[PDB]
Amino acid sequence: NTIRVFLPNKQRTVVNVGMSLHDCLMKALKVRGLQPECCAVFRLLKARLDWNTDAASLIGEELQVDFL
Amino acid sequence: MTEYKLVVVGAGGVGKSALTIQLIQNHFVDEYDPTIEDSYRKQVVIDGETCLLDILDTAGQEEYSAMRDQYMRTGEGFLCVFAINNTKSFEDIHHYREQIKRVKDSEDVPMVLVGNKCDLPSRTVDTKQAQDLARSYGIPFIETSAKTRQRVEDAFYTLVREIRQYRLKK
Ligand SMILES: Nc1nc2c(ncn2[C@@H]2O[C@H](COP(=O)(O)OP(=O)(O)NP(=O)(O)O)[C@@H](O)[C@H]2O)c(=O)[nH]1
Ligand SMILES: [Mg+2]
């Protein structure tokens, strides 16, 4: 139950997943100096996802966080 | 701008992530958050020169060991971390180093041995024993504390200097 997430500035994380995308990516963004309120999260193969989306609903797919 | 691909390896719970986060920013995580894989990028100044570090923070838990071959092939230098109150993690260093050399098919791979958690009074690996291990490997040894930031920058920067010299050995 993992999701690979590409992050801004050529970074990446793998998160183990029932909580939303915001809650489970908050820490990865914070330690890299990124405010979630300044970013959007997308599902690859890009379509923007709501930050409150259930992370469990995205298990197996690859996500990307980009500056807004 | 010169770039360095650093990889932090070692048994679970030795402090790889705490050390990496302390380098990236001043912050000490005091919680259980095992890593699967995390990559960080930071521009730093080392010996007056601006450098770009790409740091791969790896999983200590063996369930994720299938990822090791790939990151050992790609990494340019390895921060080999044990905890000074965990003799098992010190014993694990040997096999991490051997596997890196096996995967890269080379006996000369930039590495630094790091004994973390030196803020703890309870120690099971003497500094002298770890220094001697590093001496026989031919690599630097540094004792660190992610909690107090003691020698954290020194550890990563020493690894960069090892890579910088290895590239010129060409
Ligand atoms: N006292 C002390 N505790 C530390 C130090 N560094 C890390 N810790 C604690 O040790 C535990 C493990 O730290 P962590 O960085 O997550 O270890 P890890 O090597 O990344 N684990 P994993 O391989 O599973 O991802 C956490 O409780 C962290 O607070 C240190 O220098 N001193
Ligand atoms: Mg970790």
Author numbering:
A (entry chain B): 56 to 72, 75 to 102, 109 to 131
B (entry chain A): 1 to 170
Reproduce the article's own wording on this structure:
KRAS, the most frequently mutated oncogene in human cancer, produces two isoforms, KRAS4a and KRAS4b, through alternative splicing. These isoforms differ in exon 4, which encodes the final 15 residues of the G-domain and hypervariable regions (HVRs), vital for trafficking and membrane localization. RAS proteins act as binary switches, transitioning between the active [guanosine triphosphate (GTP)–bound] and inactive [guanosine diphosphate (GDP)–bound] forms. We present the structures of both the active and inactive forms of KRAS4a, as well as of the complex between KRAS4a and the primary effector protein RAF1 and compare them to previously reported KRAS4b structures.
To gain insights into the interaction between KRAS4a with its downstream effector RAF kinase, we solved the structures of KRAS4a bound to the RAS-binding domain (RBD) of RAF1 at 1.65-Å resolution and bound to the RBD and cysteine-rich domain (RBD-CRD) at 2.65-Å resolution. Figure 7A shows the superposition of the two complexes aligned using only the KRAS4a components. Strand β2 of the RBD contacts the N-terminal section of strand β2 of KRAS4a to create an extended β sheet bridging the two proteins, whereas the RAF1 CRD interacts with KRAS4a residues located on the interswitch region and helix α5. The β strands that form the intermolecular β sheet align well structurally, but the loops and helices of the RBD show noticeable positional heterogeneity, reflecting the flexibility of the molecule away from the β sheet that anchors it to RAS.
